[PDB]
């Protein structure tokens, strides 16, 4: 199990390079659509280690098809240049009746499967790459169906599941399904995420996917419980921190993960 | 179980409420449905006031003499809540009970905020957005990052006054490269 760190801000490159040298990360996961004006060759010459792609705003389910074809065309040079270990994207509502959602919406797993299927099949063809799709940190109801949803999406289109273990404990803390309900997906999955979470400002009893703190114990205890079906040759797990990105806090979590998945 | 007492509530059942501050009242505190709406209102809140804290001095210190009514007006004008967001709270502030305090300090902060937002969020092949004001011949330009040493850069560019000012209060055009050396003509704020 190789351990990675997410890279969304260029300003954090000195920090990623030094964690690459202490051997605290083995690969690095770029939020690739944040760098699509950085020359592909220049991007590639910044990382000695291998990389993975994470896409934030393809909007592949809801986007206009020609917009999505152009996004794919502009993103293919980056796949050719950096030759990443994997490509990953999101399943969520980004807008409603044309108006942006600043906090993404959970899709209707029952009602929306056929539109997601058709667009995931297409989106993978337009990139020429398998895409692993990330589960949502559910807050309200309906997310009990996500494990079946993701398995069916993988059987039907050949996609992968980028399983965010931390996002699954957020759903579990929000009365969603047990993290154990994902063991089937974990056994078939090769690429994973984990990050910190926090409570909502007005109610600490609901858990929010903030990626701004240290790993919580139920997060680490769920990695230990299912270490048997997460570790495989070629597997990766990306630690994600998007706020409070200081070297000491991040190193504490990257070394806590290697304490669960030693070299 | 249930995100509301006695009711299952999927996120699709709540999307019409996610940018409406008044909707918080439609579910009891303590149910997951109520918190979810709030989580998202505080997302809009922070996007406006964490970036343009000049708004918070005006009216109440929690800004919800400005925040709550603007969000109601945004829905009526069917705004997309895209990057032009900050310029639209400017347009609302123009006909507001707080129309005073419309500092050119604060109007440029809001246009700068919307230039930076375009540069961070836009996923087209363009690399630059330029904003022209009604009372000046200066431009504000938002640039997408093309290196990893710096993020998005917004610039105040001073020019001689020879090029047509935007006909409306604000005007936009986009740049396909990191070169400013032609004038296509102003287009309208994209809503």
């Amino acid at each position: 199990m190789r351990i990675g760190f997410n890279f969304t801000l260029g300003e954090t490159l000195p920090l990623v390079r030094q964690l690459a040298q202490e051997g605290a990360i083995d690969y690095c996961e770029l939020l690739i659509d944040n760098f699509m004006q950085v020359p592909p060759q220049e991007l590639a010459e910044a990382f000695d280690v291998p990389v993975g792609f994470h896409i934030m705003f393809s909007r592949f389910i809801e986007s206009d098809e020609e917009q999505l074809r152009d996004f794919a065309a502009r993103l293919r040079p980056y796949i050719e240049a950096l030759r990443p270990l994997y490509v990953s994207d999101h399943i969520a509502y980004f807008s409603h009746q044309g108006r942006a959602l600043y906090h993404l919406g959970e899709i209707d797993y029952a009602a929306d499967y056929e539109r997601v299927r058709a667009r995931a099949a297409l989106w993978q063809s337009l990139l020429g790459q398998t895409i692993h799709f990330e589960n949502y940190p559910s807050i309200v109801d309906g997310g009990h169906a996500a494990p079946a949803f993701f398995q069916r999406l993988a059987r039907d289109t050949g996609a992968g599941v980028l399983f965010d273990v931390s996002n699954a404990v957020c759903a579990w803390r929000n009365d969603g399904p047990e993290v154990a309900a994902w063991r089937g997906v974990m056994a078939g999955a090769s690429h994973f995420h984990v990050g910190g979470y926090a409570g909502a400002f007005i109610d600490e009893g609901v858990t929010v996917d903030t990626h701004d703190r240290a790993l919580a114990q139920d997060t680490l205890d769920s990695l230990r419980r299912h270490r048997d079906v997460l570790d495989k040759p070629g597997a990766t797990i990306t630690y994600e921190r998007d706020e409070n990105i200081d070297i000491d806090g991040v190193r504490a979590d990257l070394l806590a993960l290697r304490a669960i998945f030693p070299r | 179980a249930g995100a509301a007492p006695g009711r299952q509530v999927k996120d699709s059942e709540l999307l019409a409420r996610l940018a409406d501050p008044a909707a918080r009242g439609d579910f009891p505190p303590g149910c997951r449905a109520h918190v979810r709406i709030d989580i998202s209102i505080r997302a809009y809140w922070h996007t406006l006031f964490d970036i343009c804290p000049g708004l918070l001095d005006i009216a109440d210190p929690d800004g919800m003499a400005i925040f709550a009514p603007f969000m109601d007006w945004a829905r009526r004008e069917n705004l997309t809540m895209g990057w032009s967001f900050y310029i639209w709270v400017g347009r609302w502030l123009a006909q507001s009970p707080w129309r005073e305090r419309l500092d050119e300090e604060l109007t440029q902060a809001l246009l700068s905020a919307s230039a930076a937002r375009w540069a961070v969020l836009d996923r087209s092949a363009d690399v630059g957005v330029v904003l022209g004001r009604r009372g000046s011949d200066d431009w504000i330009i938002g640039w997408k990052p093309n290196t990893l040493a710096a993020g998005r850069r917004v610039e105040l560019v001073s020019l001689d006054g020879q090029l047509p000012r935007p006909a409306e209060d604000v005007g936009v055009f986009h740049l396909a490269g990191y070169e400013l050396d032609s004038f296509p003509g102003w287009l309208a704020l994209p809503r």
Partner: peptide, 29 residues
Amino acid sequence: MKIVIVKKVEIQVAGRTGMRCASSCGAKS
């Protein structure tokens, strides 16, 4: 046409952590 530039200066806009930013999947804090 012909753009007569005479002065550029950067404008600070708040961002993420150390500012000058980019998108991310985490919810606001």
